[PDB]
Design a protein around this ligand. Structure first.
Ligand SMILES: CC(=O)SCCNC(=O)CCNC(=O)[C@H](O)C(C)(C)COP(=O)(O)OP(=O)(O)OC[C@H]1O[C@@H](n2cnc3c(N)ncnc32)[C@H](O)[C@@H]1OP(=O)(O)O
Ligand SMILES: CC(=O)SCCNC(=O)CCNC(=O)[C@H](O)C(C)(C)COP(=O)(O)OP(=O)(O)OC[C@H]1O[C@@H](n2cnc3c(N)ncnc32)[C@H](O)[C@@H]1OP(=O)(O)O
Lengths: 154, 154
């Protein structure tokens, strides 16, 4: 859908990407066994959910290496409508993963820059994400700044 | 809940009092009643794919029964991911207790209720971002440090 430098392109995730997306996401978190039919239903949900305003709530993107037609990186930006900032739109970048054979050559930065473009084009006033301390420097190279602390419960 | 308070989902008539409550957190600005009614309709209809009826947005208010005044508000947004076997992640957002009602246990009660809503829906974790000043409050609510929040502004 959109070409990137050095033989890559970016496009929305599709139903046929399950295996390649699973392989890429391993570097982040365990995906586990997912049935093709369930994934098809997830993609349908991600391709229909819209934000009250067309704004897609979910924007699951894959960067594909043209040399082998393999998914090299994936990331998502989710759009949230809030009450604050006069019903503002806030973007949330999530599930960033560069396939282990494709790290250290600029793809992470290219992916984040693309997600940021998507969010600001929908009208988000800010885009946020959470990362471990060891990744802060990567996000600073992408134009982000420290905004707070991520807390969790399980 | 303690004597004299109750919790319920936010409603269209809550605009004026929710605007006042959220000012302790950030700038709300002016919102028209027509637009707020449309936002509450969006929040009362948007469901997450999974029957299990999962609302994407779960805006709650704690109300002082003496005068039916909103004393606190918070929301938990439910996200469907691919990782963790098409897992659900809860995102707590926009937590605010009016100044006059702070330090009486209402913030912890609100968080506890949002956490219950998220785990009852099947979330594998619930996360939130906060400024350093709020960390000890969230630790008293059972949360632990998970990472760093980063942001980029338009
Ligand atoms: C919102 C989240 O989802 S956070 C979770 C992110 N994901 C993960 O940690 C999974 C495992 N790691 C990865 O998938 C990748 O290595 C990523 C996403 C962290 C980074 O992507 P990469 O493609 O490897 O990095 P990329 O080559 O674009 O790096 C761009 C710049 O950041 C730097 N950089 C990359 N990672 C780091 C790091 N951890 N610490 C410091 N600097 C870094 C690079 O040196 C480069 O600097 P330069 O421009 O001066 O040469
Ligand atoms: C995801 C987010 O939206 S983060 C934004 C959070 N909101 C804001 O910062 C706006 C301004 N502040 C507020 O709205 C409120 O003061 C809140 C939400 C931070 C806290 O709510 P409150 O009702 O004041 O706190 P509550 O009385 O429930 O306190 C619960 C526990 O935490 C403790 N606590 C509260 N604030 C603090 C603090 N600043 N430092 C240390 N401990 C604290 C209390 O003493 C209490 O302890 P206990 O359970 O041992 O008795």
């Amino acid at each position: 859908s959109m070409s990137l430098p050095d033989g890559f392109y970016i496009r929305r995730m599709e139903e046929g990407d399950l295996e390649q997306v699973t392989e890429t996401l391993k570097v982040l978190t365990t995906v586990g066994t997912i049935t093709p039919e369930s994934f098809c239903k997830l993609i349908k949900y991600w391709n229909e959910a819209t934000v009250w305003n067309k704004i897609m709530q979910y924007n699951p993107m894959v960067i594909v290496d043209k040399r082998t037609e393999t998914v090299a990186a994936t990331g998502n930006i989710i759009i949230e409508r809030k009450i604050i900032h006069e019903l503002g739109l806030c973007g949330h970048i999530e599930d960033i993963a560069v396939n282990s054979k494709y790290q250290g050559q600029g793809l992470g930065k290219l992916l984040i820059d693309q997600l940021v473009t998507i969010g600001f084009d929908y009208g988000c006033y800010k885009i946020i994400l959470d990362c471990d301390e060891k990744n802060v420097k990567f996000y600073e190279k992408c134009g982000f700044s420290n905004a707070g602390v991520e807390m969790q419960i399980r």
